[PDB]
Amino acid sequence: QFTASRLALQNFDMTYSVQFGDLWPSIRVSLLSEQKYGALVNNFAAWDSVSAKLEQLSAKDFVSEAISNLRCFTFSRGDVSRFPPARLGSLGLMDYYLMDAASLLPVLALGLQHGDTVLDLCAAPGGKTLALLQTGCCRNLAANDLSTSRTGRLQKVLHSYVPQDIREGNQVRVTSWDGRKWGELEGDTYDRVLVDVPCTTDRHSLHEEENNIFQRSRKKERQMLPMLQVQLLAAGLLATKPGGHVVYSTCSLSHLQNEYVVQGAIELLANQYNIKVQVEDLSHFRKLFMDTFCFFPSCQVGELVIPNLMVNFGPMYFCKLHRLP
Amino acid sequence: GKLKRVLSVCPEVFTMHQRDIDRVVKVLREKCLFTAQHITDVLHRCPTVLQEDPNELEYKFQYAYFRMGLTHLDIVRTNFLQYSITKIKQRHIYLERLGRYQTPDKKGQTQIPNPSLRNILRVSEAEFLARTACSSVEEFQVFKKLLDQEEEEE
Amino acid sequence: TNCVKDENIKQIVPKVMELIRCSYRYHRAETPEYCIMVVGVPNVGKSSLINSLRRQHLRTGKAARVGGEPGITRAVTSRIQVCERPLVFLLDTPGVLAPRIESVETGLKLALCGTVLDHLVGEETMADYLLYTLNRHGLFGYVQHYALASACDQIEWVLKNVAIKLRKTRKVKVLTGTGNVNVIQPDYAMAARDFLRTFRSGLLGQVMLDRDIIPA
RNA sequence: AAUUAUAUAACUUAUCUAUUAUAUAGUAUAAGUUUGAAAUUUCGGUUGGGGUGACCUCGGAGAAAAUCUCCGAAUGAUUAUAACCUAGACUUACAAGUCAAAGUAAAAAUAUCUUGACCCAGAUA
RNA sequence: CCGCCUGUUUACCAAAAACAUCACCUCUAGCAUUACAAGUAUUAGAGGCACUGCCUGCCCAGUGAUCACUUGUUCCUAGGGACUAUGACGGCAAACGAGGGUCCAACUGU
RNA sequence: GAGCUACCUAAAAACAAUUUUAUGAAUCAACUCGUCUAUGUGGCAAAAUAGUGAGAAGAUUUUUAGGUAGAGGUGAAAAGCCU
Ligand SMILES: Nc1nc2c(ncn2[C@@H]2O[C@H](COP(=O)(O)OP(=O)(O)NP(=O)(O)O)[C@@H](O)[C@H]2O)c(=O)[nH]1
Ligand SMILES: [Mg+2]
Ligand SMILES: [Mg+2]
Ligand SMILES: [Mg+2]
Ligand SMILES: [Mg+2]
Ligand SMILES: [Mg+2]
Ligand SMILES: [Mg+2]
Ligand SMILES: [Mg+2]
Ligand SMILES: [Mg+2]
Ligand SMILES: [Mg+2]
Ligand SMILES: [Mg+2]
Ligand SMILES: [Mg+2]
Ligand SMILES: [Mg+2]
Ligand SMILES: [Mg+2]
Ligand SMILES: [Mg+2]
Ligand SMILES: [Mg+2]
Ligand SMILES: [Mg+2]
Ligand SMILES: [Mg+2]
Ligand SMILES: [Mg+2]
Ligand SMILES: [Mg+2]
């Protein structure tokens, strides 16, 4: 009677062991040991206060160091130290958000520009959605999540981290509707459409026990995930204005669920709707964050930040798609 | 000769109170369930066992027996008790997650060849990492730190 | 493969592994246990193959009833574990021949090796076949084993010699012209069995019953 | 499985003797702890019947009020801190649950938005 | 085909492939005046298991070579001392059987 | 309540003929058992009859008196036996 985590571990061994070859051992200890958190400042009240204290702890912003307007603090290579819990600031806004450094990369790779309307088709609580608010280059951020409970969390996160003036009536907008239906609701509307599809959440499913995608009863859903992911990605691609950019991000490493999904979407969009979407090179990004990330350089489409005990930031897969017309 | 080595390693066998001597033996026989002859090997092969809190000693046996699959004879023949729990947990767990070790199921079957218990502990850290685990030294050092936190947060 | 002396039986599992890798598994793609199934005609060692692999890999012991005469294993049984590392199970099934064998000769050969109960053929239209092929193929070994005078190609003669050697006789009713009479006679039937049972035991030599059909 | 367990076994502190410089011995008993021979009691519900799963209370939407189709809650943040008293009613097997004039008192009207009985234990005054 | 064999059993639907069995194996016990036993480890008790021959797993510090290093284990503080001279598995043997399948001969009102 | 039955203690009995040998060997009576079929099924019988069978110098069978008692006894384990 294997538990949900047992099945998830069992299923991963047979598949991933072939995908990476001899890196599975390394990638396997990382998922079962612990995670590494990267703190993101709120940029609204303590833009300086939190930065000074964190530096005294020896934590350094990896984004700022790489450039050598998002700034997220992470510890040095191989340092296992933790971040003191976030606190409420003088202005009434939290000091910083603790998130997996990898989650920030998609946002950072989305090439945000000033005066750009941005859509989060499946806006998970905080995470990438909060980071987009941190950057000032937004006009009308939108967020959606098929489930209503998580959005309730999303509103609290925004409230505690975003001043009311910025999150005005039209500045942000939270609607709990289906994502695939979004293909019709809007069209050629949002310049940037960050689409993070619901995924297998490898790291989480191993540790997580409740609501695990690998439960036997939930078999129905697990098989159909690639189909649902394609539809959600298709909906976002239709919505993006001509010449717009979208990023497809996923938490897992299953090639069937990361590399084929984007290629699939391209073919379905190529044929049914007679549109062409061309991928954008991220190799320059690859070379920039070598110091504080561990990714295998064999991904045909997109990039994939595998975990590693030295770094542990992961697992993420972010692909950038530009709509040529 | 058995007394000679035992006395040298553990001079206080004669000087320890009857309480400590009896308690250690009772665990080995009443809880660990070592045969009469095996116990003598434990006393002679690893004299230091006589100075370990009975409960602490019992844990060490349990960890091997249940969470490693070693038989009673395997524990005795390999001088397993002489090692320290801290080192045992680090090396075994490291492999148990790398996928280079597996706990025999009910049937006693394992789908991978577990490396020799000598390889787990007897060899040096550099030998253990290079051959049994084929891993870099740094990653292990990082793992040791993480391991401790889990104990603290256990 | 030779089941009794575990010849070449190791190679089977790697080939099954490699062979499966090329194929698809669909519904069972997630199961980690590789279950394969053994079939064939009776008395080919089908049940023995279970045991030979059962021991060669798992080193456990016999698990399927191995018997000389056809029909020992009747129904499709449950799985029998064979290996642990690939975790390979085997399904054992009863021997099936055909609803209709092709030719009278193939059916005659198929009885030589012991695939079909000999009394369905009589054991007298089959002993003759041995002498033919044994002499034809040149394996003149029965003469030495049965201390026969010299090579021959007549069942009534060889079975006369074999019967005397084994000191076996019957009381058989013969029908003469003045009425039935019971006369002691040498066991032609018993010699045929023993002549068949020596051949099948391999002490009469190695044979290639299908010859000049394989070359072509 | 739950609750026990001077069955045996062990230790520990007393009690009672011996001794001894405080001390190691024992022990017609009491109090603990460990071990467990035993003892007592039980086997929720709904699901052609058997694996597993699941589901069992209340709230929101459809069918449209009988079973079916879907979402959520065992709160959450905001805050002006929202008093006492008392007509008439709603709802309702019981139980629990709703609304509220008048009067008085604080202040200088306002709480906005979206749930578990009894017993028995507590905490402070 | 199964069980080594003579034995044993579900008085009253099961006589057997079950049970016992010599042989083999593991565990426990260093001892007297009521069992074991008026005995003393070539003994006694508890329990497993066909025997014989044949086979192979474990395990058997490493490298120099009876010698030195590297290890290992401990302490004193990353340094300093102290110490370390063969198998658990299979494969098979005649004889016997009111055992369970099968064949032929003879025999017959089946 | 062990006059049945299970096991035990003490004191006693029985085993022809034939062949092997020097025996839990062989053929087969007495004796012990109960394989297969038929009859019987309120029957002669609350387990028998008639045939056919297994053992038959042994771990055999039988006789007498004693022992173990229900939270138990006995058990070459059938959860058998204990009127
Ligand atoms: N010489 C020899 N005999 C073999 C070999 N394999 C099996 N046998 C013999 O074949 C008989 C066993 O057949 P078995 O393994 O039961 O095969 P089966 O096909 O499953 N039997 P069935 O006829 O019931 O279908 C025995 O007589 C056994 O000695 C082999 O490799 N060599
Ligand atoms: Mg009421
Ligand atoms: Mg009023
Ligand atoms: Mg027998
Ligand atoms: Mg007999
Ligand atoms: Mg009966
Ligand atoms: Mg009887
Ligand atoms: Mg009988
Ligand atoms: Mg009977
Ligand atoms: Mg038996
Ligand atoms: Mg019989
Ligand atoms: Mg006939
Ligand atoms: Mg009596
Ligand atoms: Mg006589
Ligand atoms: Mg006799
Ligand atoms: Mg007889
Ligand atoms: Mg006889
Ligand atoms: Mg008896
Ligand atoms: Mg039984
Ligand atoms: Mg009675």
Q: Does C85 touch chain A (CB under 8 A)?
A: no
Distance of CA C134 to the CA centre of its chain: 17
Which is nearest to C108 in space by CA: C3, C1, C210?
A: C210
Distance from C-alpha of B77 to C-alpha of C16, rounded to nearest angstrom: 39
Q: Does C29 touch chain A (CB under 8 A)?
A: no
Q: Does B108 touch chain A (CB under 8 A)?
A: no
The residues, ordered by sequence, that sit 6+ positions from B1 with a Cβ below 8 Å of its Cβ are none
B35 CB-to-strand E distance under 7 Å: yes
Cβ-Cβ contacts under 8 Å, C30 against chain A: 11
Cβ–Cβ contacts within 10 Å for residue A110, how many?
A: 23
For chain A, give the number of residues: 325
Given its phi and psi angles, is residue A102 left (phi above 0), alpha (psi -120 to 50 degrees) or beta? alpha
**And the tokens for A289?**
């964050």
List C158's β-bridge partners, or say none. none
Cβ–Cβ contacts within 10 Å for residue C194, how many?
A: 18
Q: Does B22 touch chain A (CB under 8 A)?
A: no
Does residue C3's CB lie within 6 angstroms of at least one atom of ligand 1? Answer: yes
Solved using: cryo-EM
CA-based Rg of chain C, rounded to a whole angstrom? 23
Burial (CB < 10 A; 0-12, 13-18, 19+), residue B123, is middle
Q: Which positions of strand E lie within 7 Å of protein CB atoms? A: 1-2, 26-29, 58-62, 70-74, 83-85, 88-92, 101-107
B37 CB-to-strand D distance under 7 Å: no
Helix (H) or strand (E) holding B124: none
Distance from C-alpha of B51 to C-alpha of B17, rounded to nearest angstrom: 11
List A247's β-bridge partners, or say none. A194, A320
The residues, ordered by sequence, that sit 6+ positions from B113 with a Cβ below 8 Å of its Cβ are C85
- List helix spans (H) across chain B: 2-9, 18-26, 36-45, 54-68, 72-77, 85-98, 117, 125-127, 137-153
B109 CB-to-strand E distance under 7 Å: no
Touching B (3+ Cβ pairs <8 A), the chains are A, C
Query: If you search the block for the tokens 């320059």, which residue do you land on?
Result: A284
Cβ–Cβ under 8 Å, residues A206 and B97:
no
CA-based Rg of chain B, rounded to a whole angstrom? 17
Residue A251 appears among annotated catalytic residues: yes
Does residue C95's CB lie within 6 angstroms of at least one atom of ligand 1? Answer: yes
Touching C (3+ Cβ pairs <8 A), the chains are A, B
CA distances from A311 to A12, A75, A231 (A): 21, 10, 33
What would the 3-class secondary structure string for chain A be? CCCHHHHHHHHHHHHHHHHHCCCHHHHHHHHHHCCCEEEEECCCCCCCHHHHHHHHCCCEEHHHHHHCCCCEEECCCCCCCCCCCCCECCCCCECEEEEEHHHHHHHHHCCCCCCCCEEECCCCCCCHHHHHHHCCCCCCEEEECCCHHHHHHHHHHHHHHCCCCCCCCCCEEEECCCCCCHHHHCCCCEEEEEEECCCCCHHHHHHCCCCCCCCCCCHHHHHHHHHHHHHHHHHHHHHEEEEEEEEEEECCCCHHHHHHHHHHHHHHHHHCCCCCEEECCCHHHHHHCHHHCCCCCCCCCCEEECCCCCCCCCCEEEEEEEECC
Distance from C-alpha of C173 to C-alpha of C176, rounded to nearest angstrom: 10
Cβ–Cβ under 8 Å, residues A118 and A112:
yes
Cis peptide upstream of residue B11 (ω within 30 degrees of 0): no
CA end-to-end span of chain C: 24
Distance of CA A106 to the CA centre of its chain: 6
Q: Which of A122, A138, A199, A251 is catalytic?
A: A251
Of all nucleotides, the one whose C1′ comes closest to residue A216's CA is D53
Does residue C66's CB lie within 6 angstroms of at least one atom of ligand 1? Answer: yes
Which is nearest to C190 in space by CA: C212, C213, C167?
A: C167
Distance from C-alpha of C60 to C-alpha of A47, rounded to nearest angstrom: 70
Amino acid at C198: T
Please give the resolution of this entry in Å, rounded to 1 decimal. 2.8
Q: Is the dihedral of CA C199, C204, C208, C210 positive or negative?
A: negative
Query: If you search the block for the tokens 């790489």, which residue do you land on?
Result: A66
Distance from C-alpha of C182 to C-alpha of C192, rounded to nearest angstrom: 22
